[PDB]
Amino acid sequence: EWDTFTGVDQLPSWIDQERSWAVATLKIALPSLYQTLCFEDAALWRTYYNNSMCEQEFPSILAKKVSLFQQILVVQVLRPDRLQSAMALFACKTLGLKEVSPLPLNLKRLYKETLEIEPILIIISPGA
Amino acid sequence: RFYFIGDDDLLEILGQSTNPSVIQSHLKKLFAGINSVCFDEKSKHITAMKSLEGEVVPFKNKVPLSNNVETWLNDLALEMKKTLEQLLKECVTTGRSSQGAVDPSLFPSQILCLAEQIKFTEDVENAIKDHSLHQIETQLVNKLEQYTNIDTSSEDPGNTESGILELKLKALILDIIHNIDVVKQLNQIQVHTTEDWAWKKQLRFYMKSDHTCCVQMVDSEFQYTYEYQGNASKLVYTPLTDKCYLTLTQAMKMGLGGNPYGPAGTGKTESVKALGGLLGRQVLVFNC
Amino acid sequence: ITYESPPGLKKNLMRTYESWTPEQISKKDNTHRAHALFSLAWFHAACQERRNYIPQGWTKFYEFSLSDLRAGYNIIDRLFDGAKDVQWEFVHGLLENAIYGGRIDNYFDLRVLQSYLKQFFIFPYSVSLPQSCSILDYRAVIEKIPEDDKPSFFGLPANIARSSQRMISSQVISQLRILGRDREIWSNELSPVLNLWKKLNQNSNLIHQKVPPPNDRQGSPILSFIILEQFNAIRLVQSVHQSLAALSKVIRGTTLLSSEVQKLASALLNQKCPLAWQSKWEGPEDPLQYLRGLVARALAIQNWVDKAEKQALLSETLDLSELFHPDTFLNALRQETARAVGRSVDSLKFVASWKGRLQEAKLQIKISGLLLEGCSFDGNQLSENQLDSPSVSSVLPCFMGWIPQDACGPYSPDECISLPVYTSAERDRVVTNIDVPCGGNQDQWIQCGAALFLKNQ
Amino acid sequence: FRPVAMSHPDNELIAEVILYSEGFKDAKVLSRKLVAIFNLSRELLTPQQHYDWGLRALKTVLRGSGNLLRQLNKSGTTQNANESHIVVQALRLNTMSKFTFTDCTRFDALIKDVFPGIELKEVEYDELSAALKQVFEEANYEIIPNQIKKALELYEQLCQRMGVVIVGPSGAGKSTLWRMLRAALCKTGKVV
Ligand SMILES: Nc1ncnc2c1ncn2[C@@H]1O[C@H](COP(=O)(O)OP(=O)(O)OP(=O)(O)O)[C@@H](O)[C@H]1O
Ligand SMILES: Nc1ncnc2c1ncn2[C@@H]1O[C@H](COP(=O)(O)OP(=O)(O)O)[C@@H](O)[C@H]1O
Ligand SMILES: [Mg+2]
Fold first, then answer.
1. Which residues of B233-268 are buried (b: 16+ CB within 10 A; e: fewer)?
2. DSSP E strands: which ranges in C234-333?
3. Atom 15 of ligand 2: nearest residue by CA position
4. Whose alpha carbon is nearest atom 15 of ligand 1?
5. Is D56 in the B-facing interface, judged by CB distances under 8 Å?
6. Contact between residue A73 and residue A33 where contact means Cβ atoms under 8 Å apart
7. Quick one: B204 exposed, middle or buried, by C-beta within 10 A (0-12, 13-18, 19+)?
8. Residues in CB range of B279: below 8 A, 6 or more apart
9. SS3 for C165-197, per residue?
10. Cα angle vertex A68, ends A66, A72, to 5°?
């Protein structure tokens, strides 16, 4: 799953060629989810293909047959305009973190933590 | 000042503490304004100073030469500053009278331009307080027409003997065109009062009660430090210089430097020297 | 410790308001004053967060400091604790002329800064629920701001996020792909370059094996332009053919190496273009797409000669994709109109239009094929983009000619906006600036950052 | 520090205020003419490596006009067409040096298009050219009019600005130029 995730068709008709080549990739690679998905629905996937904020509009009939990592496989093949929030909520569910962002960087907070055995290396960026 | 003289001339000036040929040969590289000096009838005092074209300004008191060299170079510095200070006061004192003090042989251009700008400033800040006063715009137009007409009285003779300083006129025309454009834009926007920022955007040359100048932009102010420049080429006031002057004066108000930049061949190097000219400092251009 | 900007909107506001101290904000005179401080905070946050989209919200990555923000706080201190009735004008006047415009070189980014400065002295109204001088309410409205950010808060269209998330997702996937893991010249890491060249030029041996005569100025100044164009094109094509024949013989043949062969090989292995090729003509950073564009223009200029030998270059519909230097072509039209009219060349103008043929101009040529982004073009009206708006929109054709000055232009002066006409998506160099009929409310069309590209490919 | 943008200066405002300051009266027309000449010549003529149209070339041509009007009032009288006739020579004292043959002809065709009938006037002086042909006669070279034109051109540039580049390929006569202008000037002029 992870290798075809990182990259290592006359049957669908309502999709673009750009997604159709990845459909062919998914079909040759993993035929199991291809069988479990039933891609010729055109009823629920028509609804999923049209929502905004489509990370949570999953068809709830299949909400117990598809894991969290396989939903992102669905997202990458269908619509790559969602992957950043998709990864974000995947990580937030698996780790329970309320945000993928960190806290800010108050040096008045990180004054009291340090100690004179080791020094403090402040990496800069342009404009810092 | 000796950090820019080499050793080779510095030990000359330390040794040759009375030789006039040494003084006229090496006092030029010390003070950039003075090109040469005169001497009195026994070579014991210095009484005047020159320029590149021969602009001559007398000193208000004689300068005693001696052996200890700093003990008359300090006298040169103080007496030059006091001479320009009293000469500015005398010029502005006659100029704020009703009659014109037009006598351009009697003053260097450094005091003419400054007196005209100070009197312009005080008159316009009377104006916008009182009335919109197109009379002052018409007065500036007629005054500029008068200067351009008198310019044809020296252009036809040209090269004469003991007559120069057509340049004092040409270094005055540009400031008058600047004042023309300022009053015309104040007319186009119809500013109400003085605290309106379209006036305090413009560069102001006030007078202090200690009779010395105080160049003041938006809130930052400086002081005129009486460096004698002599005749030099000034610049046309493009609106890019508005940007440059305001950034550098705010940066000096915050106690920082100033880094103008951009592509090659614009005017950033001479703009700094132009600001130093309009302010009264001395500028020591380097290379790194 | 990495010491950078916060990665989000309300993160940036939280960092800002943590960096403030409350005795600064809590003055006696309260209500109209701290709201301006919040406007400065939102303005600083907005101008920083535009930088995530390049070259859209800014053309370069301009360095904005916290010292700039503290200088602006010094300004608003000396204004409000200055006497009475602070003019909103000179706040943004001094602010553009000293602080934030002192980073800016291009003019259109100055225009964008002017628009934000004019706008923020009112908000996205539903997300903005401001309060009184109570400091922790200023803290709490930041949590009322949502987690995820929207370009509708900024002004960009919605296809921006589509292209951005496609590219950023491919970046992070390749970066996590990294964490998992002379013979190459004798191998085939560079064979598809030569393979694309052999597909471009296998039936155009005249188009890389003919010699035009070196020519001087003829009668009309549009003939000389196209002849020099032809000469430069054939020269660059044959130079490319030599530079590829050498690197072909050192691989699939029997010879040895020079240093310039190593330079070509190093640049093409890193898949950048060599400096010798960019000395002549600026192209795309893809060398493959570079060879594509070059051979396309090589076909084109011969067709341009064939239809311009007969002075029939006025009638036919032509396209500016095929000119290596199109502004020189347009200034050649300037000379022919200034010679045909009987007026000096300095006293003309350049206006194009869409609502019919030019009347007062001397010549009329049909230019189409332009591409537009940041909006959705229609005749007489610019319309805002949508969620499902495609990125590249084609355009209605145009009529271009040269008009004498102080004549009646086809469009009224206060209904149009000037748009740059760049060369490709990189937004590098400006050809001209055509006016497009807006019809009021121009500031939205500023903050979209509308552009116009001469072509692609 | 505190950075300042100084990217683009103006060209019409400076050129009109300078000419109005330097006694010339018709600045508001001719300044725009100068700036349009700069923009067109930079814009359509073939982009060689070594050309320039910066602020320095403009500041040169303005003093080149101020000097000619400084001569032609103390040495004579003033009238109409000479006042717009001067600026063509005061521009071609600089701009002629850079060009090739054909680009100089096309530049002349552009000068005809901005100024309709005020086309040409050549080098005023010849008594130095007699000494120059004398020194060529002395050192057993030949006498080519092109070398004469380039040497008189060099003397013009050396009077005009501070530094001169002499671009040329190998052996094609670019050092004999100053080498003979040395003696040809030194026979009358002071010390070289
Ligand atoms: N008037 C002339 N008639 C004939 N030959 C001449 C004349 N003037 C110069 N030459 C020849 O031209 C040759 C080269 O002269 P010159 O050194 O100026 O060329 P150059 O380009 O400066 O050389 P380099 O390439 O070393 O810089 C000399 O050998 C000289 O004999
Ligand atoms: N505002 C101006 N008015 C008149 N001349 C100017 C002005 N600005 C620049 N110049 C001229 O341009 C030339 C170059 O200016 P400089 O400051 O040296 O620019 P750079 O350092 O980029 O070469 C100078 O000779 C100067 O006289
Ligand atoms: Mg030589």
1. ebbbbbebbebbbbbbbbbbeeeeebebebeeebbb
2. 318-319
3. B267
4. D173
5. yes
6. yes
7. buried
8. B215, B222, B224, B225
9. HHHHHHHHHHHHHHCCCCHHHHCCCCHHHHHHH
10. 95
Residue C103 near residue C62 (C-beta atoms within 8 A): yes
The residue count of chain B comes to: 288
Tell me the backbone φ, ψ of residue A2, rounded to 5 degrees.
Answer: -70, -30
Structure tokens at C207: 């188009």
d(CA B180, CA B188): 12
Count CB atoms within 10 A of the CB of residue C383: 10
Largest CA distance in chain C: 88
| B–D interface: beta-carbon pairs under 8 A | 86
Q: How was this structure determined?
A: cryo-EM
Q: Is C137 helix (H, G, I), strand (E, B) or coil?
A: helix
CA A8 to chain CA mean position, Å: 17
Q: Are strands C376-378 and C381-383 parallel, antiparallel or unpaired?
A: antiparallel
**What is residue C433's three-state secondary structure?**
strand
Task: Determine which helix (DSSP H) or strand (DSSP E) holds C418, and give its type and residue range.
Answer: strand C416-420
What phi and psi, each to the nearest 5 degrees, are found at residue D125? -105, 150
Which chain A residue's Cα is nearest to C149?
A85
State which residue of chain D sits closest to B173, comparing Cα positions. Answer: D21
Distance CA B178, CA B236 (A): 9
CB contact under 8 Å between D74 and B240, yes or no, is no
Neighbours of B176 (CB within 10 A): 18
Residue numbers in the known binding site of D for ATP are 142, 147, 171-176
Q: Is D37 exposed, middle or buried (0-12, 13-18, 19+ CB in 10 A)?
A: buried
Cβ atoms C400, C454 nearer than 8 A: no
At residue B58, φ and ψ (nearest 5 deg) are: -75, 160
Let me know: does B148 contact B129? Beta carbons within 8 Å.
no
Q: How many residues would you count in chain A?
A: 128
Q: Where are the alpha helices (DSSP H) in B231-267?
A: 240-253
CA distance A38 to chain C (A): 26
Supply φ then ψ for residue D3, to 5 degrees. Answer: -80, 145
| Stretch (H or E) spanning D145 | helix D145-160
B9 in helix, strand or coil?
helix
- Bridge partners (DSSP) listed for residue C376: C383
Are the C-beta atoms of residues B72 and B45 closer than 8 Å to each other?
A: no
- Looking at the CA of D170, name the nearest ligand: 1
The burial of B124, by beta-carbon neighbours within 10 Å (0-12 exposed, 13-18 middle, 19 or more buried), is given as: buried
Residues 6+ apart with CB under 8 A from C224: C215, C216, C217, C218
Are C102 and D2 a contacting pair, CB within 8 Å?
A: yes
Interface membership of D36 toward C (CB under 8 Å)? yes
Q: Between β-strands C348-353 and C398-404, what pairing exists: parallel, antiparallel or unpaired?
A: antiparallel
D85 lines ligand 1 (CB under 6 A): no
| All residues with CB under 5 Å from ion ligand 3 | D 175
Residue D180 CA: nearest ligand 1 atom is 8
Option in C90, C102, C105 nearest B247 (CB): C102
Binding site for ADP: residue ranges of D?
A: 56
Distance from C-alpha of B277 to C-alpha of B232, rounded to nearest angstrom:
9
Q: Is B21 in a helix, a strand, or coil?
A: helix
The Cα–Cα gap between C454 and C322 comes to 10
The rounded distance, in Å, linking the Cα atoms of C436 and C448 is 14
Q: Which of B42, B48, B51, B50 is nearest to B18 (CA)?
A: B42
CB atoms within 10 A of CB C361: 24
d(CA B22, CA B12): 8
